[PDB]
Amino acid sequence: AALSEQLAELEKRSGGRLGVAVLDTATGRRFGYRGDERFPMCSTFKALLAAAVLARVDQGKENLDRRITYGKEDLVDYSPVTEKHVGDGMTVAELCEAAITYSDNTAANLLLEALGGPAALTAFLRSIGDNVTRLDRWEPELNTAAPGDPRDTTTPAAMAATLRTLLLGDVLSPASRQQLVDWLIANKTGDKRLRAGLPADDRVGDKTGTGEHGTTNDIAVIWPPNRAPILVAVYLTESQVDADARDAVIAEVARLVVAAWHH
Numbered sequence: 001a002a003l004s005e006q007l008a009e010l011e012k013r014s015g016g017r018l019g020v021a022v023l024d025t026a027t028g029r030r031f032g033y034r035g036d037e038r039f040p041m042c043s044t045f046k047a048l049l050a051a052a053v054l055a056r057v058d059q060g061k062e063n064l065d066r067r068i069t070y071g072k073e074d075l076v077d078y079s080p081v082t083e084k085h086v087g088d089g090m091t092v093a094e095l096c097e098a099a100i101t102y103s104d105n106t107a108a109n110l111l112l113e114a115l116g117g118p119a120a121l122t123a124f125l126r127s128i129g130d131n132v133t134r135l136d137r138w139e140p141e142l143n144t145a146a147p148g149d150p151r152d153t154t155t156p157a158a159m160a161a162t163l164r165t166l167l168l169g170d171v172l173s174p175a176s177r178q179q180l181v182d183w184l185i186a187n188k189t190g191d192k193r194l195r196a197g198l199p200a201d202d203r204v205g206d207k208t209g210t211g212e213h214g215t216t217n218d219i220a221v222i223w224p225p226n227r228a229p230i231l232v233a234v235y236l237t238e239s240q241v242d243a244d245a246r247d248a249v250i251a252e253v254a255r256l257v258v259a260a261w262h263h
């Protein structure tokens with residue numbers, strides 16, 4: 001009857017560990033289910049990576065139009081955008097778009113290099129008040145999702161709070177803020193997850209993640225019509241159901257949250 005026990009049932013059926021955080025900016029109303037447990041980020045870190053790059057652009061230490069050249073030797077598996085541009089390279093802006101909207105692994109690695117590595121991303125997160133999220137490794141090894149491993153993890157509550165600070169706070173310039181929002185709104189990988197359980201008229205930006213040990217994640221900023229945005233972070237790991245069913249778990253979280261929020 002309570003959202004918390006609805007999620008426990010759903011978590012039971014998934015065979016894994018489910019983490020949910022909701023941060024409604026209209027009210028400050030938070031919700032958490034395992035909100036302070038660590039979960040593997042997998043590709044959800046790429047939303048933070050893009051923010052860190054934009055911070056440099058605001059600082060004048062990076063330009064969105066700067067062209068990065070690379071080769072076949074740089075290509076990491078699942079690189080559907082960067083694999084097409086070994087011959088002409090891609091700009092920093094194009095790499096951010098590829099990392100966010102397609103989870104392009106090579107794009108993420110090239111942006112990490114422009115930033116100074118996973119330690120540089122973690123330091124950026126510390127500088128903006130996130131004392132929990134950490135990136136340690138590169139693509140594709142950060143997707144190992146080994147239980148009990150703190151490397152490359154966040155908590156649902158910390159991720160939602162960090163998304164609020166970056167997408168709605170003062171950390172980024174209004175131009176960079178809107179650009180990060182625009183990239184998330186254009187995401188191509190999340191049609192079967194949170195989006196599949198949200199009202200059709202909701203405006204959604206999201207970043208998915210997928211990894212070993214049955215790991216399937218989705219984090220989002222959501223604008224209901226004529227309403228302040230809501231930040232949602234859903235992490236599922238150690239799952240024992242197949243890929244489509246893991247997607248369905250995330251969609252059902254969105255359905256249960258909206259229902260619980262409207263009644």
Ligand SMILES: O=[N+]([O-])c1ccc2nn[nH]c2c1
Binds near residue numbers: 022198222231232254
């Ligand atoms: O995902 N949500 O947290 C969420 C909550 C309430 C809503 N009303 N419309 N869409 C919503 C999404």
